[PDB]
Enzyme design. Structure first.
Site, PDB file in Angstrom:
ATOM      1  N   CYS A 120       0.817  -1.214   0.000  1.00  0.00           N
ATOM      2  CA  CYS A 120       0.000   0.000   0.000  1.00  0.00           C
ATOM      3  C   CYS A 120       0.850   1.263   0.000  1.00  0.00           C
ATOM      4  CB  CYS A 120      -0.937   0.029   1.207  1.00  0.00           C
ATOM      5  SG  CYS A 120      -1.866   1.573   1.363  1.00  0.00           S
ATOM      6  N   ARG A 129       0.082   4.765   2.851  1.00  0.00           N
ATOM      7  CA  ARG A 129       0.195   4.554   4.293  1.00  0.00           C
ATOM      8  C   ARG A 129       0.561   5.793   5.100  1.00  0.00           C
ATOM      9  NH1 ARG A 129       4.117  -0.380   4.743  1.00  0.00           N
ATOM     10  NH2 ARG A 129       4.443  -0.028   2.495  1.00  0.00           N
ATOM     11  N   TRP A 186      -9.295   6.269  -0.748  1.00  0.00           N
ATOM     12  CA  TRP A 186      -9.598   6.931  -2.012  1.00  0.00           C
ATOM     13  C   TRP A 186      -8.642   6.405  -3.075  1.00  0.00           C
ATOM     14  CZ3 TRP A 186      -8.476   9.995   2.385  1.00  0.00           C
ATOM     15  CH2 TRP A 186      -7.146  10.426   2.505  1.00  0.00           C
ATOM     16  N   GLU A 204      -4.647   3.616 -10.765  1.00  0.00           N
ATOM     17  CA  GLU A 204      -5.440   2.410 -10.550  1.00  0.00           C
ATOM     18  C   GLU A 204      -6.604   2.376 -11.538  1.00  0.00           C
ATOM     19  OE1 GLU A 204      -6.292   1.200  -6.268  1.00  0.00           O
ATOM     20  OE2 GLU A 204      -5.791   3.361  -6.057  1.00  0.00           O
TER      21      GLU A 204
HETATM   22  C1  HEM Z   1      -6.424   6.548   1.917  1.00  0.00           C
HETATM   23  C2  HEM Z   1      -6.062   6.377   0.625  1.00  0.00           C
HETATM   24  C3  HEM Z   1      -5.378   5.094   0.092  1.00  0.00           C
HETATM   25  C4  HEM Z   1      -4.658   5.018  -1.041  1.00  0.00           C
HETATM   26  C5  HEM Z   1      -4.339   6.170  -2.022  1.00  0.00           C
HETATM   27  C6  HEM Z   1      -4.207   3.660  -1.209  1.00  0.00           C
HETATM   28  C7  HEM Z   1      -3.456   3.247  -2.282  1.00  0.00           C
HETATM   29  C8  HEM Z   1      -3.217   1.940  -2.575  1.00  0.00           C
HETATM   30  C9  HEM Z   1      -2.789   1.415  -3.859  1.00  0.00           C
HETATM   31  C10 HEM Z   1      -2.557   2.251  -5.144  1.00  0.00           C
HETATM   32  C11 HEM Z   1      -2.652   0.091  -3.719  1.00  0.00           C
HETATM   33  C12 HEM Z   1      -2.262  -0.923  -4.820  1.00  0.00           C
HETATM   34  C13 HEM Z   1      -3.608  -1.563  -5.205  1.00  0.00           C
HETATM   35  C14 HEM Z   1      -3.668  -2.265  -6.553  1.00  0.00           C
HETATM   36  O1  HEM Z   1      -2.725  -2.105  -7.390  1.00  0.00           O
HETATM   37  O2  HEM Z   1      -4.688  -2.985  -6.793  1.00  0.00           O
HETATM   38  C15 HEM Z   1      -2.997  -0.268  -2.350  1.00  0.00           C
HETATM   39  C16 HEM Z   1      -2.947  -1.537  -1.820  1.00  0.00           C
HETATM   40  C17 HEM Z   1      -3.341  -1.899  -0.548  1.00  0.00           C
HETATM   41  N1  HEM Z   1      -3.911  -1.048   0.385  1.00  0.00           N
HETATM   42 FE1  HEM Z   1      -3.899   1.017   0.291  1.00  0.00          FE
HETATM   43  N2  HEM Z   1      -4.645   2.891  -0.131  1.00  0.00           N
HETATM   44  C18 HEM Z   1      -5.394   3.755   0.668  1.00  0.00           C
HETATM   45  C19 HEM Z   1      -6.055   3.375   1.797  1.00  0.00           C
HETATM   46  C20 HEM Z   1      -5.973   2.122   2.318  1.00  0.00           C
HETATM   47  C21 HEM Z   1      -6.674   1.688   3.510  1.00  0.00           C
HETATM   48  C22 HEM Z   1      -7.662   2.571   4.320  1.00  0.00           C
HETATM   49  C23 HEM Z   1      -6.297   0.416   3.748  1.00  0.00           C
HETATM   50  C24 HEM Z   1      -6.710  -0.544   4.887  1.00  0.00           C
HETATM   51  C25 HEM Z   1      -7.305  -0.136   6.026  1.00  0.00           C
HETATM   52  C26 HEM Z   1      -5.361   0.031   2.707  1.00  0.00           C
HETATM   53  C27 HEM Z   1      -4.793  -1.207   2.649  1.00  0.00           C
HETATM   54  C28 HEM Z   1      -4.218  -1.749   1.540  1.00  0.00           C
HETATM   55  C29 HEM Z   1      -3.809  -3.130   1.412  1.00  0.00           C
HETATM   56  C30 HEM Z   1      -3.937  -4.277   2.444  1.00  0.00           C
HETATM   57  C31 HEM Z   1      -3.228  -3.227   0.024  1.00  0.00           C
HETATM   58  C32 HEM Z   1      -2.666  -4.514  -0.618  1.00  0.00           C
HETATM   59  C33 HEM Z   1      -3.852  -5.161  -1.346  1.00  0.00           C
HETATM   60  C34 HEM Z   1      -3.425  -6.415  -2.072  1.00  0.00           C
HETATM   61  O3  HEM Z   1      -2.315  -6.953  -1.779  1.00  0.00           O
HETATM   62  O4  HEM Z   1      -4.214  -6.878  -2.936  1.00  0.00           O
HETATM   63  N3  HEM Z   1      -5.189   1.085   1.818  1.00  0.00           N
HETATM   64  N4  HEM Z   1      -3.336   0.894  -1.671  1.00  0.00           N
HETATM   65  N1  9M9 Z   2      -5.469  -7.415  -7.992  1.00  0.00           N
HETATM   66  C1  9M9 Z   2      -6.640  -8.101  -7.413  1.00  0.00           C
HETATM   67  C2  9M9 Z   2      -7.621  -7.104  -6.814  1.00  0.00           C
HETATM   68  C3  9M9 Z   2      -8.990  -7.259  -7.042  1.00  0.00           C
HETATM   69  C4  9M9 Z   2      -9.898  -6.346  -6.508  1.00  0.00           C
HETATM   70  C5  9M9 Z   2      -9.429  -5.277  -5.740  1.00  0.00           C
HETATM   71  C6  9M9 Z   2      -8.062  -5.113  -5.506  1.00  0.00           C
HETATM   72  O1  9M9 Z   2      -7.640  -4.035  -4.760  1.00  0.00           O
HETATM   73  C7  9M9 Z   2      -6.406  -3.954  -4.034  1.00  0.00           C
HETATM   74  C8  9M9 Z   2      -6.554  -2.684  -3.225  1.00  0.00           C
HETATM   75  C9  9M9 Z   2      -6.681  -2.751  -1.840  1.00  0.00           C
HETATM   76  C10 9M9 Z   2      -6.855  -1.594  -1.083  1.00  0.00           C
HETATM   77  C11 9M9 Z   2      -6.882  -0.358  -1.716  1.00  0.00           C
HETATM   78  C12 9M9 Z   2      -7.034   0.806  -0.967  1.00  0.00           C
HETATM   79  C13 9M9 Z   2      -7.061   2.034  -1.626  1.00  0.00           C
HETATM   80  C14 9M9 Z   2      -6.921   2.076  -3.013  1.00  0.00           C
HETATM   81  N2  9M9 Z   2      -6.933   3.272  -3.666  1.00  0.00           N
HETATM   82  N3  9M9 Z   2      -6.764   0.927  -3.714  1.00  0.00           N
HETATM   83  C15 9M9 Z   2      -6.744  -0.281  -3.097  1.00  0.00           C
HETATM   84  C16 9M9 Z   2      -6.592  -1.444  -3.861  1.00  0.00           C
HETATM   85  C17 9M9 Z   2      -7.158  -6.024  -6.053  1.00  0.00           C
END
Ligand code: HEM
Ligand code: 9M9
Ligand code: HEM
Ligand code: 9M9
Ligand code: H4B
Ligand code: H4B
Ligand code: ZN
Lengths: 405, 404
Positions: A109, A112, A281, A286
């Site tokens: 993520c 963070r 958000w 994405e």
């Molecule tokens: C507040 C604005 C946030 C932004 C801009 C953001 C941004 C991102 C992005 C760009 C990714 C890569 C996702 C992808 O390529 O599909 C990601 C992954 C992830 N985010 Fe964040 N996020 C945010 C909030 C959060 C929140 C609130 C949580 C959890 C409470 C979170 C937990 C995670 C986790 C666990 C992943 C890994 C998901 C996976 O491995 O499939 N994010 N985030």
């Molecule tokens: N690549 C498999 C797959 C399928 C569906 C959703 C997804 O999302 C990952 C993910 C998790 C948390 C997020 C939080 C914020 C954000 N902007 N994107 C986020 C994207 C990933």
């Protein structure tokens, strides 16, 4: 000198050592013989107790009461509970700490920097699928906030021994249907073909658009999933237009405001929350690069390039790169115009660098997955590309879990 | 046991069995993955086993394993190690070894070309002056008036208690970086150090942005010597843009030949500390990294202002817009000058073909995802969606300490 991974930023020439990886209690997939870091998903009360003890220690450190009487009493309180029930329960503030720490610990993520600002809705009293739906609608309402998005997570009851799980079957709370056509192609989002067919099998009357919002399949313990349609007014969507290319609006493209992941498992202190959907958000890439331009997603690159009159017959015209930029620009511009929170990949990565610096001070490191943190367009233009990163698993954590069917 | 490797665009799966042939440790452990780090943190029976392994690979490649020539060669190697503590490769073995090292290089996207490598044996070199002659012939051969050909020149191997043959430059052709005492750098900031070493070894410096550096060549236990490359040898390409007329005014240019000269080549336990090799550029190396990196020439903002973009905010994507036009300028210009170059889409498409070839030939292919995925438009290329396994096979190219 020091016995920890040396980490370098190649733009700035600055060095740090990650000491935090020493706290990792779980092995990832790499060995000295081969690195498997680019893989998306690589392959007892005594065990619970040690995990529980470790979490309680983390909690009492965070509140600076380590070694105290209340700390030792909470330890005895947990061990007793496990001794008599085989499991234990978190205090509310423990749950809040735990959910925030899981976000803070998420290596993939980039958002963070925001981790300390997370609204945690306790839904551990929920006892039906109807009730799950109410909590979810309230989550969406609070999280959407009419475009001024607010990070939030809603936690449903934990896995219980001798009871079925709470599960949300959809991967996100908001997703577009994917309809398989009788010619082999897909109308809508090909990512969502399977879940679309599950919804139909479960009694949904399917639409036939490219942007039909899916209903929720919600599963309370030991019951079949029940189908719930989100009221359209709760699902905020942004019609995409481009600031200079007037035809772009005519493409009829759109995306939803709220990225609300709903199929991940939240693990805290050995306890497992199989349903704990969370949202933040979007980062613009994405939507604009992955969801709209992936060949196995909406795949609109060629369409946009033809409208831009690019030479699509040769790689060396960079038509793919030119179209992708304009699509990303359309996403940013349309969200800003509609007053819905969005972050571009430059602002996001710059803020992530600040977060790395914060965590170096607070914890002596920050687990990060380079391949996921670096954005899918303009990689080396952002500062994270030039930053070495250490990847490792810390707990509390969000984890993938198998699909319930 | 064997990693399951998946392509997320096509849904297809392979299993890498080739990784079991790795005898050398990378930096990762189960506790933490260090795959994004650029550089590693830091008797006769060992040499003999690496030598036997290599000789076995060689005779297997010519479909002659078990043959008498195979058996006699293993005995020669053994007899020579037992007596002298080392041994020497035959020219054919050396040629096979250099090609395998390229094939095995996990950071190289250009490996579809691996079987086509001209190998110059320079192991009969005894002086800096002779290294310079070999280097000039290498450059002449490889450049071929713009029709670039991959080549490697191999200087004498390392020997016990004797200093190494070394080329001090990181590439045979590099632009000087001059540190003006008002903080800034004129030229290529990556080359401040080598530029200063050249000056103090008696080079008369220029004051331009693209002054081609002289070569500092070192024969064993001698001070390095300075040699100026004859300018007619160094092919350069002026950069212009197919539709932006002002672009050419920037006076931008780059050399045709990417010729890395500071990596160690290891074959069968033998180490070759000077073995410069060259292929041809992928356009993003020049456009994106060399010109647009903040710690290199850093031209993004300049170009963005010329295009009249909003430099005030990140959300106008000015950087992405200017980067694309620079990469287009490079491709256009090289194509116009009839100098070989490959764009990042064509390169990555060919790399996917390579993975397929290698899957059938060897049951896998070592690949460093972070290096194979290009620095712009990553997920717009097929490699982005391809899982990869990284590991070390021998023969191999390795990093080695700077000789100063
Ligand atoms: C507040 C604005 C946030 C932004 C801009 C953001 C941004 C991102 C992005 C760009 C990714 C890569 C996702 C992808 O390529 O599909 C990601 C992954 C992830 N985010 Fe964040 N996020 C945010 C909030 C959060 C929140 C609130 C949580 C959890 C409470 C979170 C937990 C995670 C986790 C666990 C992943 C890994 C998901 C996976 O491995 O499939 N994010 N985030
Ligand atoms: N690549 C498999 C797959 C399928 C569906 C959703 C997804 O999302 C990952 C993910 C998790 C948390 C997020 C939080 C914020 C954000 N902007 N994107 C986020 C994207 C990933
Ligand atoms: C023929 C055309 C070739 C192309 C298009 C090509 C492409 C590339 C590219 C883009 C990189 C990344 C470089 C960087 O970012 O600095 C690379 C790395 C590398 N290449 Fe190739 N290459 C070619 C030929 C060769 C040859 C002939 C050899 C050796 C005989 C070779 C060996 C290597 C090695 C060892 C690396 C890793 C370098 C490092 O770790 O610093 N390549 N290649
Ligand atoms: N990253 C440090 C550093 C310093 C100096 C040169 C260099 O080049 C790496 C390299 C190695 C081999 C290559 C072969 C072909 C090519 N087009 N680029 C290639 C680039 C890398
Ligand atoms: C094979 C590779 O790991 C896969 O395509 C990854 C690469 N990096 C990614 N990065 C992000 N943020 N999201 C992703 O889904 C992926 N996919
Ligand atoms: C820190 C990070 O590993 C480093 O910037 C890498 C990323 N990927 C790369 N990829 C290539 N081809 N060349 C590079 O120099 C780098 N640098
Ligand atoms: Zn690894």
């Amino acid at each position: 000198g020091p016995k920890f991974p040396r980490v370098k930023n190649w733009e700035l020439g600055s060095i740090t050592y990650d000491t935090l990886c020493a706290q990792s209690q779980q092995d990832g997939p790499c060995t000295p013989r081969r690195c498997l870091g680019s893989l998306v998903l690589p392959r007892p009360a005594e065990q619970l107790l040690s995990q529980a003890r470790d979490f309680i220690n983390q909690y009492y450190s965070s509140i600076k009461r380590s070694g105290s009487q209340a700390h030792e009493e909470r330890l005895q309180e947990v061990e007793a509970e496990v001794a008599s029930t085989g499991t234990y329960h978190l205090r509310e503030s423990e749950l809040v700490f735990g959910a925030k720490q899981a976000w803070r610990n998420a290596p993939r993520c980039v958002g963070r920097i925001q981790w300390g600002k997370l609204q945690v809705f306790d839904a551990r009293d929920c006892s039906s699928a109807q009730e799950m739906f109410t909590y979810i609608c309230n989550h969406i309402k609070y999280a959407t906030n009419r475009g001024n998005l607010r990070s939030a997570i809603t936690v449903f009851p934990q896995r219980a021994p001798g009871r079925g799980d709470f599960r949300i079957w959809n991967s996100q709370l908001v997703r577009y249907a994917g309809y398989r056509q009788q010619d082999g192609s897909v109308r809508g989002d090909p990512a969502n073909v399977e879940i679309t067919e599950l919804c139909i099998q479960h009694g949904w009357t399917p639409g036939n658009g490219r942007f039909d919002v899916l209903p929720l399949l919600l599963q309370a313990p030991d019951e079949a999933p029940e189908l719930f349609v989100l009221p359209p007014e709760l699902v905020l969507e942004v019609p995409l237009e481009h600031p200079t290319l007037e035809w772009f609006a005519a493409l009829g493209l759109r995306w939803y405001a709220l990225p609300a992941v709903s199929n991940m498992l939240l693990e805290i202190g050995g306890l497992e929350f199989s349903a704990a959907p969370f949202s933040g958000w979007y980062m613009s890439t994405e939507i604009g690069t992955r969801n709209l331009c992936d060949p196995h997603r909406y795949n609109i690159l060629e369409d946009v390039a033809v409208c831009m009159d690019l030479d699509t017959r040769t790689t060396s015209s960079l038509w793919k790169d030119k179209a992708a930029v304009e699509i990303n620009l359309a996403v940013l511009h349309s969200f800003q115009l509609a007053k819905v929170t969005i972050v571009d990949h430059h602002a996001a990565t710059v803020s992530f660098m600040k977060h790395l610096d914060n965590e170096q001070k607070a914890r002596g490191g920050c687990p990060a997955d380079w391949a996921w943190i670096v954005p899918p367009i303009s990689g080396s233009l952002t500062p994270v590309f030039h930053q070495e990163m250490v990847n490792y698993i810390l707990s509390p954590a969000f984890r993938y879990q198998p699909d319930p069917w």
